[PDB]
Design a protein around this ligand. Structure first.
Ligand SMILES: *[C@@H]1O[C@H](CO[C@@H]2O[C@@H](C)[C@@H](O)[C@@H](O)[C@@H]2O)[C@@H](O[C@@H]2O[C@H](CO)[C@@H](O)[C@H](O)[C@H]2NC(C)=O)[C@H](O)[C@H]1NC(C)=O
Ligand SMILES: *[C@@H]1O[C@H](CO)[C@@H](O)[C@H](O)[C@H]1NC(C)=O
Ligand SMILES: *[C@@H]1O[C@H](CO)[C@@H](O)[C@H](O)[C@H]1NC(C)=O
Ligand SMILES: [Ca+2]
Ligand SMILES: [Ca+2]
Ligand SMILES: [Ca+2]
Ligand SMILES: [Ca+2]
Ligand SMILES: [Ca+2]
Ligand SMILES: [Ca+2]
Ligand SMILES: [Ca+2]
Lengths: 51, 372, 50, 50
């Protein structure tokens, strides 16, 4: 396994709703961090992207 | 009783079915004192030796007067023979009493010393003999070296392992694949093993070695008037500077060096040559040999035959020569460590036999390269 | 005495101390005009300049 | 990469010629790889002995 996708369907922005985070797996004892965030289309509040 | 824990630890570490554990008990100062008060200190004996079996901390024919440890063992058994307390010298102890003039009847100790050897026969099993905690020098009250007590051991039938020491060792492995381990030697020490056919001559150079030696203590008692004195043997530790000893090995196929810079050479049979830590030189000679350089900057010569090299993704650089025949170098024996994964990730090695180099830490240091 | 110590892997952004310890005696002291003598010991790092 | 003396290194010692007591001296150096590379290095200490 390379990465874990984590969804936040109720993230609030004035024009977008929903957020998914890309998390590569930690190496050894290193800390776990997020690197990229995926988003839905614009103008779709409360779209629950990432449910 | 805390000795049960250490006997159990030794039994677990060696994968031993049971541990024998010769123990040596010097006469208590109370007993010798009482022998002085009574006046009959003559016929007493100062050192007594007991032997038991110990499985996980609970419970062999020996003659102290002749230097022979005779233990019986059965095939498939995998026991261990250790010395819990320093083993005394061979031979029989004798005592007398001399008038010594105004001083009242002082001088007492002497040892016959017809033999200067301890002989250990193990029988028929996969026996482990731990030759540490054995006296290697005997001296008088004047501090002069009389004899170098030497150890002779016989192996029998199965795979036998002996862990060496500073004493002059004549190890007869008998049948089976046998091993001698010099892993107790420090970093400042070294061995140089040379082959004389089927026999091995081992020259050990120990710098500031620490060795048990047996002398003669002296306890004295006044009893309201002119003094009567006694003496007794006394094992002790001391560092004797530079020591050179020449061991002899027969029917031994595997040798492990110490923590120093060793030079180990094999013969025409199949050998397991391990160097351990330090900048060791290993040469296998003829036959199909297995060669483990260990840590340090090792130079390894395989010779003829099909040889096996075992590596460990270390930080040092090694020099490896295969010789004639089809040879193999293997890097998969060891599991990668945590810091290796942290610093390098999932990258292993870059090997190229045209260039003749194997890079164990590519793009992180350029000098961790094995030349083959 | 020139003590040379070889480290096969000196890591990135890591550090260590190297103490040099021994006992002294004062039978070598020269009664010069100055009331003191300095004992200087130098430690310098080498590497493959090529 | 830099090498520096460190504070705990002995700064001062004094003695009386009428007394023959000895003393312990330590020179502590600190070595750091502040660069972006890891390399094998060698440390050389010159020690006045006699
Ligand atoms: C200093 O290093 C050079 C070069 O070493 C090579 O390149 C490095 C980056 C590293 O990968 C090393 O493992 C390489 O071997 C040494 O010069 C080489 O020496 C070897 C024998 O020791 C010889 O076979 C090569 O032809 C030499 N190459 C060159 C370009 O000179 C040099 O010996 C090192 N100096 C010291 C004092 O060790
Ligand atoms: C060196 O010694 C000092 C003593 O004050 C200590 O603080 C420091 O951590 C030491 N160096 C390393 C690398 O630990
Ligand atoms: C060094 O000197 C000190 C004080 O004189 C003493 O306590 C210590 O044992 C000495 N150490 C050695 C190794 O001589
Ligand atoms: Ca046997
Ligand atoms: Ca045998
Ligand atoms: Ca070694
Ligand atoms: Ca061989
Ligand atoms: Ca080695
Ligand atoms: Ca060979
Ligand atoms: Ca070969």
């Amino acid at each position: 396994t390379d990465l874990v996708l984590i969804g936040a369907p109720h993230y609030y922005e004035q024009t977008r709703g929903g957020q998914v985070s890309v998390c590569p797996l930690p190496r050894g004892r290193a800390r776990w961090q997020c690197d990229a965030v995926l988003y839905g289309e614009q103008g779709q509040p409360w779209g629950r992207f990432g449910a | 009783d805390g000795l049960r824990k250490m006997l159990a630890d030794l039994q677990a570490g060696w994968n031993a079915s049971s541990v024998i554990g010769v123990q040596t008990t010097e006469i208590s100062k109370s007993a010798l004192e009482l022998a002085a008060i009574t006046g009959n200190a003559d016929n007493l004996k100062s050192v007594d030796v007991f032997v038991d079996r110990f499985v996980q901390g609970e419970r062999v024919v020996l003659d102290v007067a002749a230097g022979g440890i005779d233990i019986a063992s059965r095939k498939g058994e995998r026991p261990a023979l250790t010395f819990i307390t320093p083993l005394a010298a061979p031979g029989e102890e004798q005592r007398r009493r001399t008038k010594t003039g105004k001083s009242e009847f002082t001088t007492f100790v002497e040892i016959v010393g017809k033999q200067d050897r301890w002989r250990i026969r193990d029988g028929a099993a996969d026996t482990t003999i731990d030759l540490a905690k054995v006296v290697s020098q005997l001296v008088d009250a004047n501090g002069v070296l009389k004899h170098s007590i030497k150890l002779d051991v016989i192996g029998g039938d199965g795979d036998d392992v002996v862990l060496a020491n500073a004493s002059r060792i004549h190890y007869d492995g008998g049948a089976g694949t046998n091993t001698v381990s010099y892993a107790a030697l420090g970093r400042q020490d070294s061995i140089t093993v040379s082959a004389d056919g089927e026999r091995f001559n081992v020259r050990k150079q120990l710098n500031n070695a620490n060795v048990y030696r047996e002398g003669v203590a002296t306890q004295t008692t006044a009893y309201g008037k002119r003094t009567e004195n006694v003496q007794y043997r006394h094992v002790e530790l001391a560092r004797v500077g530079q020591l050179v000893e020449v061991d002899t090995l027969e029917h031994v196929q595997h040798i492990i060096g110490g923590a120093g810079n060793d030079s180990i050479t094999g013969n025409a049979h199949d050998n397991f040559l391990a160097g351990g830590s330090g900048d060791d030189r290993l040469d296998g000679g003829a036959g199909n040999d297995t060669l483990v350089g260990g840590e340090g900057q090792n130079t390894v010569i395989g010779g003829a035959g099909d040889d096996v090299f075992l590596q460990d993704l270390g930080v040092w650089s090694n020099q490896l020569d295969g010789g004639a025949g089809v040879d193999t170098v293997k890097y998969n024996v060891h599991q990668p460590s945590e810091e290796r994964l942290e610093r390098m990730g999932d990258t292993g090695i870059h090997a190229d036999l045209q260039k003749g180099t194997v890079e164990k830490w590519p793009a992180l240091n350029l000098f961790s390269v094995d030349h083959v | 005495q020139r003590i040379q110590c070889d480290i096969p892997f000196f890591g990135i952004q890591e550090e260590f101390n190297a103490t040099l310890k021994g006992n002294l005696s004062f039978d070598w002291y020269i009664k010069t005009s100055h009331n003191h003598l300095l004992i200087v010991s130098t430690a310098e790092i080498l590497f493959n300049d090529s | 990469m830099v090498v520096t003396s460190h504070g705990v290194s002995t700064k001062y010692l004094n003695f009386t010629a009428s007394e023959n007591t000895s003393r312990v001296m330590q020179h502590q150096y600190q070595v750091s790889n502040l660069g972006q590379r890891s390399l094998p290095i060698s440390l050389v200490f010159l020690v006045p002995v006699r």
